[PDB]
Design an enzyme around this catalytic site. Structure first.
Site, mmCIF file in Angstrom:
data_model
loop_
_atom_site.group_PDB
_atom_site.id
_atom_site.type_symbol
_atom_site.label_atom_id
_atom_site.label_comp_id
_atom_site.label_asym_id
_atom_site.label_seq_id
_atom_site.Cartn_x
_atom_site.Cartn_y
_atom_site.Cartn_z
ATOM 1 N N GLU A 135 0.810 -1.231 -0.099
ATOM 2 C CA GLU A 135 0.201 -0.077 -0.163
ATOM 3 C C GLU A 135 1.046 1.241 0.025
ATOM 4 O O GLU A 135 0.694 2.243 0.739
ATOM 5 C CB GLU A 135 -1.072 0.182 1.119
ATOM 6 C CG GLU A 135 -1.900 -1.303 1.040
ATOM 7 C CD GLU A 135 -2.785 -1.420 2.499
ATOM 8 O OE1 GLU A 135 -3.010 -0.552 3.203
ATOM 9 O OE2 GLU A 135 -3.689 -2.304 2.265
ATOM 10 N N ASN A 182 1.656 -5.369 -2.932
ATOM 11 C CA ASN A 182 0.193 -5.462 -2.727
ATOM 12 C C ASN A 182 -0.671 -4.206 -2.245
ATOM 13 O O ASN A 182 0.025 -3.492 -1.671
ATOM 14 C CB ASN A 182 0.304 -6.459 -1.544
ATOM 15 C CG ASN A 182 -1.011 -7.061 -1.148
ATOM 16 O OD1 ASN A 182 -1.640 -7.936 -1.913
ATOM 17 N ND2 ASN A 182 -1.535 -6.668 0.203
ATOM 18 N N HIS A 218 -10.663 -6.008 -1.159
ATOM 19 C CA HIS A 218 -11.750 -5.627 -0.199
ATOM 20 C C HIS A 218 -12.882 -4.698 -0.709
ATOM 21 O O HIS A 218 -12.693 -3.632 -0.777
ATOM 22 C CB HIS A 218 -11.104 -5.030 1.031
ATOM 23 C CG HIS A 218 -9.822 -5.600 1.476
ATOM 24 N ND1 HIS A 218 -10.516 -6.712 2.305
ATOM 25 C CD2 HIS A 218 -8.730 -5.684 2.039
ATOM 26 C CE1 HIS A 218 -9.203 -7.401 3.068
ATOM 27 N NE2 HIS A 218 -8.401 -6.413 3.027
ATOM 28 N N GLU A 248 -6.751 -10.693 -0.694
ATOM 29 C CA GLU A 248 -7.320 -10.362 0.598
ATOM 30 C C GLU A 248 -8.797 -10.289 0.256
ATOM 31 O O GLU A 248 -9.558 -9.306 1.141
ATOM 32 C CB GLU A 248 -6.854 -9.085 1.169
ATOM 33 C CG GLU A 248 -5.389 -9.291 1.422
ATOM 34 C CD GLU A 248 -4.936 -7.781 2.368
ATOM 35 O OE1 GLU A 248 -5.442 -7.229 2.843
ATOM 36 O OE2 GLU A 248 -3.339 -7.666 2.243
ATOM 37 N N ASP A 250 -12.775 -10.064 0.499
ATOM 38 C CA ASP A 250 -13.868 -10.186 1.233
ATOM 39 C C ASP A 250 -14.844 -9.107 0.538
ATOM 40 O O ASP A 250 -14.579 -8.324 -0.180
ATOM 41 C CB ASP A 250 -13.724 -10.182 2.610
ATOM 42 C CG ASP A 250 -12.880 -8.873 3.090
ATOM 43 O OD1 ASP A 250 -13.018 -7.950 2.462
ATOM 44 O OD2 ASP A 250 -12.338 -8.784 4.322
HETATM 45 O O1 LIG Z 1 -7.034 -2.561 3.739
HETATM 46 C C1 LIG Z 1 -7.178 -3.632 4.720
HETATM 47 C C2 LIG Z 1 -6.111 -4.296 5.275
HETATM 48 O O2 LIG Z 1 -6.314 -5.547 6.229
HETATM 49 C C3 LIG Z 1 -5.086 -5.829 6.921
HETATM 50 O O3 LIG Z 1 -5.120 -6.699 8.101
HETATM 51 C C4 LIG Z 1 -5.722 -6.788 9.480
HETATM 52 C C5 LIG Z 1 -5.726 -5.680 10.214
HETATM 53 O O4 LIG Z 1 -4.814 -4.564 9.825
HETATM 54 C C6 LIG Z 1 -5.659 -5.807 11.611
HETATM 55 O O5 LIG Z 1 -5.971 -4.626 12.583
HETATM 56 C C7 LIG Z 1 -6.523 -6.529 12.286
HETATM 57 O O6 LIG Z 1 -6.461 -6.716 13.732
HETATM 58 O O7 LIG Z 1 -6.355 -7.943 11.534
HETATM 59 C C8 LIG Z 1 -6.600 -7.839 9.967
HETATM 60 C C9 LIG Z 1 -7.229 -9.171 9.940
HETATM 61 O O8 LIG Z 1 -7.696 -9.814 11.068
HETATM 62 C C10 LIG Z 1 -4.076 -6.009 6.123
HETATM 63 O O9 LIG Z 1 -2.613 -6.418 6.581
HETATM 64 C C11 LIG Z 1 -3.641 -5.032 4.779
HETATM 65 O O10 LIG Z 1 -3.020 -5.494 3.840
HETATM 66 C C12 LIG Z 1 -5.087 -4.400 4.159
HETATM 67 O O11 LIG Z 1 -5.014 -2.932 4.091
#
Ligand SMILES: OC[C@H]1O[C@@H](O[C@H]2[C@H](O)[C@@H](O)[C@H](O)O[C@@H]2CO)[C@H](O)[C@@H](O)[C@@H]1O
Ligand SMILES: *[C@@H]1O[C@H](CO)[C@@H](O)[C@H](O)[C@H]1NC(C)=O
Ligand SMILES: *[C@@H]1O[C@H](CO)[C@@H](O)[C@H](O)[C@H]1NC(C)=O
Ligand SMILES: *[C@@H]1O[C@H](CO)[C@@H](O)[C@H](O)[C@H]1NC(C)=O
Ligand SMILES: *[C@@H]1O[C@H](CO)[C@@H](O)[C@H](O)[C@H]1NC(C)=O
Ligand SMILES: *[C@@H]1O[C@H](CO)[C@@H](O)[C@H](O)[C@H]1NC(C)=O
Lengths: 334, 333
Positions: A135, A182, A218, A248, A250
């Site tokens: 990102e 990514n 997402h 990722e 969902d």
């Molecule tokens: O853009 C969404 C974001 O999702 C990220 O994963 C994690 C999140 O960062 C964390 O706070 C949460 O507790 O766990 C989720 C999954 O359980 C991911 O790393 C990113 O690439 C993405 O940006």
């Protein structure tokens, strides 16, 4: 017969899922039975435990133990692992974000280099891939680089630097690990996607290794780009002589669900998986966890949820219910 | 007066139910009150705890504790037990699926032989029967053997081997345990059923003990084979000098149920039970659990459920409601 068998039959390396392991998920036997089900999941990504604050909690002090517990669990299920992630603006420890003395280009560059080189070298071929930079691009203006501690201190070069030092670690240890960029909002044509394609082009021009781009995916039900939109976007990346992955996935709804928005979800899961299936060099699909109980969504997008393939109407440690979204995925692969 | 009273009055050994015990069900007092109701259930099968991953979690280290807990609970309400199962493709521990070094015919065969012989020996006549081999036959093409770690490594002989080593155990320890083959999609005439019949014929011809075939009977409402279809199919098996049992009966629907699909469900439960009733050497009917709340169906088939004899409209830990399907079973008996 499940998603992973179907994906591998279509020439993919996996149907995968993220999991927030180590963590409360491990105490849920109904969750774990399905995580361990290789009919559905032949790939996985650690949701958190390989991020910078957990792996380097103090400067030059590395902690691999939780990550290794994750890898051990994955390995027991024959899952290929997308290691995630090396350099990102978020989940950074306080020594990086709030140092007693201000970073310079020189000193932060060394921090980046050491973090990248040690994680890649340490884990070796336990990782199928690394998300080396996560990102880096802004949403506003869409084309541009994101402002974050790396960018502000090092400049745009931090991206090339990360890949260059990850490459050094693979060469120095004769690894096979793939190096991925990514990002989100790059799953449809537009300035952000184009900017990601220009990152790939720039790295290739410098003879810096980059193997793939991760398309986070997402999405919100109804806002997801059409299958066709995703097909042509995927082709734009793969024409640069790289792979793509859906990393990722969902598809969140505004709560509560209803018949229309659930039908949208099924369609949007289908579209994304079908677009991967139509793309020779899309190596696989990973969902960002598979059980609503543990999904990141409802914490992060208030009044949204219901985003995953299964849910537990009676909460943690009770049976799973498979959603129609699951069949959307499977049909897309058949 | 319940299903098990009615089945026993008809010459059957039980009406039975599977249960996923030990587990969550043990914490539901309304579930356990019905489970323990011998008027309805005089037989049971453990849904998970006697499988390979639980009973041999590392090579030659057996764990019988969970299984023994199940057997003790079953004994308390006077249930006969269909122990389930010894050799099956799924639910195998990572010491078998993800070995340090490759299995060969020899090394896997001894794993099989040792598993089968020690489980049968150990539990002895606590078990009415063992499902010695589960689901050896393919759906595609229907006739053929299923590819799995046993068949791929050991060949088709793994089936006769499992029964041979189960028979050894019963002979060594003077047991009464019956040895069953158990499978789905063999409840109606066709290649898969004919293939399972051929397994029985092959074993009998080689003087290997095989006492019964288990007809799983996981059906969909309206797709269930007619009572008449089940009656012939059962006769094809019993003519080989074995028993049959209906081992995992449930009749799932596409949610939500409606008046037509629920009537179909009643008809299908009736048809299956009635076919067993008609069949002298069908020894009993077991349902694959009896309470929708805990059924396997919703985790496996999206948009399906309502498969069982009871449900709890108010959720876990609240009273059961007996469905029309229950009366279908009773009337068949
Ligand atoms: O853009 C969404 C974001 O999702 C990220 O994963 C994690 C999140 O960062 C964390 O706070 C949460 O507790 O766990 C989720 C999954 O359980 C991911 O790393 C990113 O690439 C993405 O940006
Ligand atoms: C899932 O697999 C892991 C790794 O072998 C194991 O620790 C866990 O107990 C398994 N859980 C299941 C199968 O419910
Ligand atoms: C290392 O991480 C583990 C698990 O994530 C944690 O328990 C431990 O306290 C961490 N720090 C160390 C070992 O210094
Ligand atoms: C379904 O939810 C969406 C998003 O909130 C909404 O636009 C739509 O009107 C809803 N349809 C219903 C409640 O029938
Ligand atoms: C059912 O019987 C078992 C075994 O004796 C017992 O542990 C349990 O308390 C019983 N539950 C009831 C009757 O609600
Ligand atoms: C009942 O459900 C079946 C199966 O989904 C369906 O085919 C039928 O049209 C439904 N009948 C109604 C709603 O009256």
């Amino acid at each position: 017969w499940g998603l992973n068998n179907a994906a591998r039959a279509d020439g993919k390396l996996w149907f995968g899922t993220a999991a927030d392991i180590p963590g409360l998920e491990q105490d849920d036997r109904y969750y774990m039975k399905e995580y361990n089900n290789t009919h559905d999941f032949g790939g996985t990504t650690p949701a958190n435990i390989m991020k910078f604050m957990f792996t380097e909690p103090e400067q030059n002090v590395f902690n691999f133990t939780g990550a290794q517990e994750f890898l051990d669990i994955a390995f027991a299920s024959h899952k290929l692992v997308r290691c995630h992630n090396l350099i990102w603006q978020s989940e950074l420890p306080t020594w990086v974000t709030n140092p007693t003395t201000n970073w310079t280009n020189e000193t932060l560059s060394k921090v980046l280099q050491n973090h990248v080189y040690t994680l890649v070298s340490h884990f070796g071929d336990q990782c199928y891939s690394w998300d080396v930079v996560n990102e880096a691009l802004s949403d506003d203006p869409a084309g541009s680089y994101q402002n974050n501690i790396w960018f502000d201190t090092i400049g745009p070069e931090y991206v090339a630097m990360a890949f260059e030092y990850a490459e050094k670690a693979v060469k120095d240890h004769k690894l096979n690990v793939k190096l991925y960029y990514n990002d989100y909002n790059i799953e449809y044509p537009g300035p952000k996607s184009t900017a990601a394609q220009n990152i790939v082009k720039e790295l290739k021009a410098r003879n810096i290794q980059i193997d793939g781009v991760g398309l986070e995916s997402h999405f919100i039900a109804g806002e997801t780009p059409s299958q066709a939109t995703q097909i042509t976007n995927m082709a734009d990346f793969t024409s640069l002589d790289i792979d793509v992955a859906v990393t990722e996935l969902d598809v969140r709804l505004y709560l509560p669900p209803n018949a229309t928005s659930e039908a949208q979800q099924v369609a949007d899961y289908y579209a994304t998986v079908a677009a991967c299936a139509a793309t020779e060099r899309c190596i696989g699909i990973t969902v960002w966890d598979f059980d609503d109980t543990y999904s990141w969504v409802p914490s992060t997008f208030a009044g949204q949820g219901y985003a995953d393939l299964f849910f537990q109407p009676d909460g943690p440690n009770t049976p799973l219910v498979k959603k129609a979204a699951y069949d959307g995925c499977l049909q897309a692969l058949q």
